[PDB]
Scaffold this motif. Structure first.
Motif, mmCIF file in Angstrom:
data_model
loop_
_atom_site.group_PDB
_atom_site.id
_atom_site.type_symbol
_atom_site.label_atom_id
_atom_site.label_comp_id
_atom_site.label_asym_id
_atom_site.label_seq_id
_atom_site.Cartn_x
_atom_site.Cartn_y
_atom_site.Cartn_z
ATOM 1 N N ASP A 7 0.833 -1.201 0.000
ATOM 2 C CA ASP A 7 0.000 0.000 0.000
ATOM 3 C C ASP A 7 0.867 1.249 0.000
ATOM 4 O OD1 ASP A 7 -2.705 1.180 0.211
ATOM 5 O OD2 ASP A 7 -1.958 1.969 2.121
ATOM 6 N N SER A 8 1.967 1.185 0.745
ATOM 7 C CA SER A 8 2.903 2.299 0.851
ATOM 8 C C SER A 8 3.556 2.576 -0.493
ATOM 9 C CB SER A 8 4.003 1.980 1.866
ATOM 10 O OG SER A 8 4.920 3.055 1.979
ATOM 11 N N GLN A 10 2.462 1.554 -3.518
ATOM 12 C CA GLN A 10 1.416 1.951 -4.457
ATOM 13 C C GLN A 10 1.148 3.443 -4.356
ATOM 14 O OE1 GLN A 10 -2.301 -0.089 -3.896
ATOM 15 N NE2 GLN A 10 -3.283 0.870 -5.675
ATOM 16 N N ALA A 11 1.130 3.940 -3.121
ATOM 17 C CA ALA A 11 0.885 5.355 -2.855
ATOM 18 C C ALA A 11 2.091 6.188 -3.255
ATOM 19 C CB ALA A 11 0.617 5.577 -1.374
ATOM 20 N N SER A 12 3.265 5.749 -2.813
ATOM 21 C CA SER A 12 4.519 6.437 -3.110
ATOM 22 C C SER A 12 4.707 6.574 -4.612
ATOM 23 C CB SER A 12 5.706 5.655 -2.543
ATOM 24 O OG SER A 12 5.672 5.632 -1.127
ATOM 25 N N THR A 14 2.441 5.960 -6.789
ATOM 26 C CA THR A 14 1.202 6.529 -7.311
ATOM 27 C C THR A 14 1.209 8.043 -7.161
ATOM 28 O OG1 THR A 14 -0.109 4.564 -6.741
ATOM 29 C CG2 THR A 14 -1.303 6.621 -7.097
ATOM 30 N N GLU A 15 1.480 8.498 -5.942
ATOM 31 C CA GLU A 15 1.524 9.925 -5.633
ATOM 32 C C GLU A 15 2.621 10.609 -6.431
ATOM 33 O OE1 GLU A 15 2.131 10.311 -1.458
ATOM 34 O OE2 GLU A 15 0.103 9.655 -0.921
ATOM 35 N N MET A 16 3.771 9.945 -6.511
ATOM 36 C CA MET A 16 4.923 10.467 -7.242
ATOM 37 C C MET A 16 4.611 10.568 -8.726
ATOM 38 S SD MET A 16 8.002 11.589 -6.986
ATOM 39 C CE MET A 16 8.607 10.993 -5.410
ATOM 40 N N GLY A 18 1.976 11.327 -10.058
ATOM 41 C CA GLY A 18 1.181 12.533 -10.270
ATOM 42 C C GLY A 18 2.084 13.752 -10.381
ATOM 43 N N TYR A 19 3.195 13.712 -9.653
ATOM 44 C CA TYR A 19 4.165 14.803 -9.648
ATOM 45 C C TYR A 19 4.809 14.949 -11.017
ATOM 46 C CZ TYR A 19 4.029 15.100 -4.549
ATOM 47 O OH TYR A 19 3.631 15.278 -3.244
#
Length: 44
Positions: A7-8, A10-12, A14-16, A18-19
């Motif tokens: 999950d971490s 996927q977010a990392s 995932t969030e990145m 977007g950057y």
């Protein structure tokens, strides 16, 4: 934990992700897009 690892990540990632799109989109779109305004607007 694995939940946090999966999950971490996927977010990392995932969030990145977007950057990059935001930065690239802005840089290429904004930077490259803005330029077109001067060239297209000035030229045009």
């Amino acid at each position: 934990p694995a939940k946090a690892a999966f999950d971490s990540l996927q977010a990392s990632a995932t969030e990145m992700i977007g950057y990059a799109w935001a930065m690239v989109v802005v840089i290429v779109g904004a930077t490259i897009g803005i330029k077109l305004f001067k060239k297209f607007t000035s030229k045009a």
